[PDB]
Enzyme design. Structure first.
Site, mmCIF file in Angstrom:
data_model
loop_
_atom_site.group_PDB
_atom_site.id
_atom_site.type_symbol
_atom_site.label_atom_id
_atom_site.label_comp_id
_atom_site.label_asym_id
_atom_site.label_seq_id
_atom_site.Cartn_x
_atom_site.Cartn_y
_atom_site.Cartn_z
ATOM 1 N N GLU A 1 0.815 -1.221 0.000
ATOM 2 C CA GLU A 1 0.000 0.000 0.000
ATOM 3 C C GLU A 1 0.845 1.265 0.000
ATOM 4 O O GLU A 1 0.329 2.362 0.123
ATOM 5 C CB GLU A 1 -0.924 0.005 1.219
ATOM 6 C CG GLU A 1 -1.700 -1.278 1.381
ATOM 7 C CD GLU A 1 -2.974 -1.111 2.181
ATOM 8 O OE1 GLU A 1 -3.063 -0.178 3.024
ATOM 9 O OE2 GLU A 1 -3.889 -1.934 1.963
ATOM 10 N N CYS A 2 2.149 1.087 -0.165
ATOM 11 C CA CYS A 2 3.128 2.158 -0.089
ATOM 12 C C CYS A 2 3.070 3.013 -1.365
ATOM 13 O O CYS A 2 2.733 2.507 -2.448
ATOM 14 C CB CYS A 2 4.523 1.509 0.081
ATOM 15 S SG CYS A 2 5.869 2.568 0.513
ATOM 16 N N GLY A 3 3.398 4.298 -1.238
ATOM 17 C CA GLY A 3 3.685 5.128 -2.410
ATOM 18 C C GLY A 3 4.790 4.550 -3.294
ATOM 19 O O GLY A 3 4.722 4.653 -4.503
ATOM 20 N N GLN B 1 1.729 -0.803 5.950
ATOM 21 C CA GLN B 1 1.397 -0.793 4.515
ATOM 22 C C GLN B 1 1.417 -2.196 3.887
ATOM 23 O O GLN B 1 1.350 -2.367 2.655
ATOM 24 C CB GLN B 1 2.341 0.179 3.796
ATOM 25 C CG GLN B 1 2.090 1.623 4.271
ATOM 26 C CD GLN B 1 2.939 2.619 3.564
ATOM 27 O OE1 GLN B 1 3.966 2.269 2.979
ATOM 28 N NE2 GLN B 1 2.536 3.877 3.609
ATOM 29 N N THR C 1 5.245 1.482 -3.970
ATOM 30 C CA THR C 1 4.905 0.056 -4.227
ATOM 31 C C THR C 1 4.959 -0.319 -5.704
ATOM 32 O O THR C 1 5.544 -1.333 -6.082
ATOM 33 C CB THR C 1 3.498 -0.328 -3.642
ATOM 34 O OG1 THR C 1 3.578 -0.332 -2.210
ATOM 35 C CG2 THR C 1 2.996 -1.713 -4.152
#
Ligand SMILES: [Cl-]
Length: 155
Positions: A34-36, A70, A38
């Site tokens: 869910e990370c930027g 995340q 990703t």
């Protein structure tokens, strides 16, 4: 002791010995869904596997929910996500801690011998054929900058 002496449950629930990777170069990465970082990271890691995999190299991806939480989902969900979204073909492992008292011993080893522990998602350790850490980068370092260091080690 070196990195390839450790064991880890793979993402499908099968226990494996990291001994199976001795003689090979490994890029050990803590991953999140869910990370930027990703999308760009999973795309770059799979391209890395595509390009350097045939030269006795693997990305070894360990999901971790410690950094911003995340990676909240199941091992099943994470694998499905990686395989369907990014056509991931590198080894993936069951979710673990990479930092703190409960960190996976393999990750204690990488932090103790490199002097750097992960402080976010998508930290990367380069492991040489003999299981020793030769590099570590945070997620802000591009795979363009990491890759040449890997190609230096492979044959
Ligand atoms: Cl290169």
């Amino acid at each position: 002791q070196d990195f390839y002496d450790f064991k880890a449950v793979n993402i499908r629930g099968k226990l494996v010995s990291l001994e199976k990777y001795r003689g090979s170069v490994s890029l050990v990465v803590n991953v999140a869904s869910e990370c930027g970082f990703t999308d760009q990271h999973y795309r770059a890691l799979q391209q890395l596997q595509r390009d350097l995999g045939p030269h006795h190299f693997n990305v070894l991806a360990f999901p971790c929910n410690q950094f911003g939480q995340q990676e909240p989902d199941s091992n099943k969900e994470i694998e499905s996500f990686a395989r369907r979204t990014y056509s991931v073909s590198f080894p993936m492992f069951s979710k673990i801690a990479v930092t703190g008292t409960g960190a996976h011993p393999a990750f204690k080893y990488l932090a103790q011998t490199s002097g750097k522990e992960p402080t976010w998602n998508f930290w990367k350790y380069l492991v040489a054929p003999d299981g020793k850490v030769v590099g570590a980068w945070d997620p802000t370092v591009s795979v363009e900058e990491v890759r040449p260091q890997i190609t230096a080690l492979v044959r």
